Ligand binder design. Sequence first.
Ligand SMILES: *[C@@H]1O[C@H](CO)[C@@H](O[C@@H]2O[C@H](CO)[C@@H](O[C@@H]3O[C@H](CO)[C@@H](O)[C@H](O)[C@@H]3O)[C@H](O)[C@H]2NC(C)=O)[C@H](O)[C@H]1NC(C)=O
Ligand SMILES: *[C@@H]1O[C@H](CO)[C@@H](O[C@@H]2O[C@H](CO)[C@@H](O[C@@H]3O[C@H](CO)[C@@H](O)[C@H](O)[C@@H]3O)[C@H](O)[C@H]2NC(C)=O)[C@H](O)[C@H]1NC(C)=O
Ligand SMILES: *[C@@H]1O[C@H](CO)[C@@H](O[C@@H]2O[C@H](CO)[C@@H](O)[C@H](O)[C@H]2NC(C)=O)[C@H](O)[C@H]1NC(C)=O
Ligand SMILES: *[C@@H]1O[C@H](CO)[C@@H](O[C@@H]2O[C@H](CO)[C@@H](O)[C@H](O)[C@H]2NC(C)=O)[C@H](O)[C@H]1NC(C)=O
Ligand code: NAG
Ligand code: NAG
Ligand code: ZN
Lengths: 596, 96
Amino acid sequence: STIEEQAKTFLDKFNHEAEDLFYQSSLASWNYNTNITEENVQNMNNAGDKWSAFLKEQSTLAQMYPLQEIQNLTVKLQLQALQQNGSSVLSEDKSKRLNTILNTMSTIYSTGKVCNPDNPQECLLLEPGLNEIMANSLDYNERLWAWESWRSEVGKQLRPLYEEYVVLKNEMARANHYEDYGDYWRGDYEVNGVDGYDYSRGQLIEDVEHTFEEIKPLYEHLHAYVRAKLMNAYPSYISPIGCLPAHLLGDMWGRFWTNLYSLTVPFGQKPNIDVTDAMVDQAWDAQRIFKEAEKFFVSVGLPNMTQGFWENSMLTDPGNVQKAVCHPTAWDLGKGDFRILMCTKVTMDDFLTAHHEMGHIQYDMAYAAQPFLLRNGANEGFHEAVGEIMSLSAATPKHLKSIGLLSPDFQEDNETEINFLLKQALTIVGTLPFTYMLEKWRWMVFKGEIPKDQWMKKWWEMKREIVGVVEPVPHDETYCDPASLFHVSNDYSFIRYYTRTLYQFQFQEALCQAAKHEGPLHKCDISNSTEAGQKLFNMLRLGKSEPWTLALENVVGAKNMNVRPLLNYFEPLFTWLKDQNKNSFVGWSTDWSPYA
Amino acid sequence: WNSNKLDSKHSGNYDYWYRSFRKSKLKPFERDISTEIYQAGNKPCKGKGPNCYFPLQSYGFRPTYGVGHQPYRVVVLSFELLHAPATVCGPKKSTN
Ligand SMILES: *[C@@H]1O[C@H](CO)[C@@H](O[C@@H]2O[C@H](CO)[C@@H](O[C@@H]3O[C@H](CO)[C@@H](O)[C@H](O)[C@@H]3O)[C@H](O)[C@H]2NC(C)=O)[C@H](O)[C@H]1NC(C)=O
Ligand SMILES: *[C@@H]1O[C@H](CO)[C@@H](O[C@@H]2O[C@H](CO)[C@@H](O[C@@H]3O[C@H](CO)[C@@H](O)[C@H](O)[C@@H]3O)[C@H](O)[C@H]2NC(C)=O)[C@H](O)[C@H]1NC(C)=O
Ligand SMILES: *[C@@H]1O[C@H](CO)[C@@H](O[C@@H]2O[C@H](CO)[C@@H](O)[C@H](O)[C@H]2NC(C)=O)[C@H](O)[C@H]1NC(C)=O
Ligand SMILES: *[C@@H]1O[C@H](CO)[C@@H](O[C@@H]2O[C@H](CO)[C@@H](O)[C@H](O)[C@H]2NC(C)=O)[C@H](O)[C@H]1NC(C)=O
Ligand SMILES: *[C@@H]1O[C@H](CO)[C@@H](O)[C@H](O)[C@H]1NC(C)=O
Ligand SMILES: *[C@@H]1O[C@H](CO)[C@@H](O)[C@H](O)[C@H]1NC(C)=O
Ligand SMILES: [Zn+2]
């Protein structure tokens, strides 16, 4: 019979079964996350087994309909999602070895500890130990010792497993009629079909290259300023014209540069903004924080929170009676059940995290009308970006001053703005080269352009060419540096962050311009604007039902990634950097090495 | 009206079913109780399993669902003002 009707009926059955199954799985996961009990672990394992078995069985019945006979553009995406062989392409021994190696790598990374030499009774774990050493120590030799050690014991012990991991992953990728596993990750951004909105898998690489080729001068000036400022803390350990060694960056891997705020502050005489005192003087609790977030979100025309949200969601840690894992999370259990889990104390950081998670919840609540397979973000970048635009808008001094949390006579000057811009820059702009370099290296490895005996010769050159960091000690083929990261040891992509960073500023500029803002971008509030709320909602409620290009066009107006807002948000910071470093050395050279 | 307090269970009040599939349309004021297996293809239909489906699917009422999934009891009083005989009874307010 009309094949499309049979496919539609199969989708109708799947939608009704999956809802209840997924609800049960999510509820079990929530209950386990709130408490800690062995039988709860057993129940979670059973529920996950049931969910996985149901999904695997329902996948088989979907293979009867070939994809080529469908003219609907809506059921096609659902069938394409369901028709994908999850792990059935491989043989049984292949799956056994793959699961074995994945669990082995995860366990090895999880239980890593280091012992200080000549002290058998003195050992430190990575997170309990090396993080504190890296983040809050001004010493020199100890940092080098830890940096050499952790890599020495981890990379040499994890490289051979990663070799077989790569081999098996490539085997599976070729089995699924793809090019390589990097293509498998690149496929998430693929949209094929509708004319005028094609996006091939290979276009993303060129787009990333072209977009990154523009911010490099700003990164160059910021890096020159950083190197100039570091001459006060390390007078006799920094090369005058060389690249910054990676062992003095305040992190194990150098993902962020946030820990340098107190060392590179432009005008340290005046302290920054912290609203703790007024919060304490009015006896604030979590209820007031969350209702303030609700008021801010309803100010732009978005709906409120559900009645059950204030009842089923915990806001503060119960105490010693129970035992949970304190990590902010917005839960989408489905069927009108939305909850927020966070251990709250009165501080500005939690006040911003509240807005982040509530924006997450609003995005979840936007697309509840779509079918089950379509209930997610347009791609893997929209979600945190929508979360963070609210945070950027809600922490400006004008908003705090208006809502009565600050003195009504509070005189905003042009002296704190440089400090605020530098604080934002050291955590937003200083991380893009790291992500770009890591993704470039990973894609080159998956494609295979780098021979096994010449990995480091290209890895350490890419560092010098992109991040501007040089290794402090010579390394041989025994080391496997990249595997030490959390997202490298575990199977996870890394190109999400670049897209999120580019998207958030584009969204902010569009909303501010449509919101009748006067002045530079950094002093903008998206409040009081239905004009900026309807525009955002036209993108929020689509879900995955439309190509992400069209969803972007309803807000930004352009269907491609843009970089202009990222440079626009830092115009006065760029001006000050240009003024300051007129008498210094520009650029970095690969000539100075501490060991030679 | 809402009926959460008497139509829900923690495991689930799996006692309400609803029709989902049919190769036909309905007519006003019709009741069907057919439980015959539903055909989707040309092939002969033999029980559940392949494309043949049972044309009855159940609800999943739970106490912590949202407003849009909680049960509302609907009693459709379709009194057509034309019951002629016995119709016209009258509350007939009376006074002193
Ligand atoms: C692709 O397939 C889907 C599923 O068949 C099509 O969805 C259908 O779209 C029409 C509108 O084009 C919907 O029609 C309207 O339904 C409401 C009741 O929901 C009724 O009051 C209106 O008078 C009208 O009939 C229809 O409900 C909807 N069906 C489903 C199951 O979602 C879609 O249109 C197809 N797309 C293309 C490009 O043809
Ligand atoms: C979503 O949030 C808004 C804002 O908090 C809620 O608005 C509420 O609206 C009612 C009706 O105006 C307010 O109650 C009272 O209205 C009378 C006039 O009828 C007025 O004289 C009283 O002074 C008072 O304003 C209510 O205070 C107001 N806010 C609150 C906190 O409820 C709205 O009801 C919320 N709705 C949803 C769907 O969540
Ligand atoms: C994975 O998906 C592919 C889809 O190409 C399945 O391929 C089929 O392979 C069998 C045996 O060679 C053929 O009879 C089918 O006609 C193929 N289907 C198609 C659409 O090409 C493959 O079987 C799947 N592997 C599983 C489910 O284990
Ligand atoms: C931005 O939002 C605030 C929300 O309070 C607006 O403040 C109110 O504005 C009216 C204007 O007549 C005052 O009467 C109220 O007392 C204000 N409430 C306050 C300060 O809590 C503010 O007006 C909005 N922005 C603009 C430019 O209209
Ligand atoms: C969590 O554990 C406490 C004590 O063990 C118990 O009182 C509570 O009911 C548990 N939570 C749930 C959702 O059952
Ligand atoms: C503020 O503006 C004045 C204008 O003359 C300028 O001199 C000054 O450097 C600016 N910034 C600070 C930090 O005061
Ligand atoms: Zn987030």
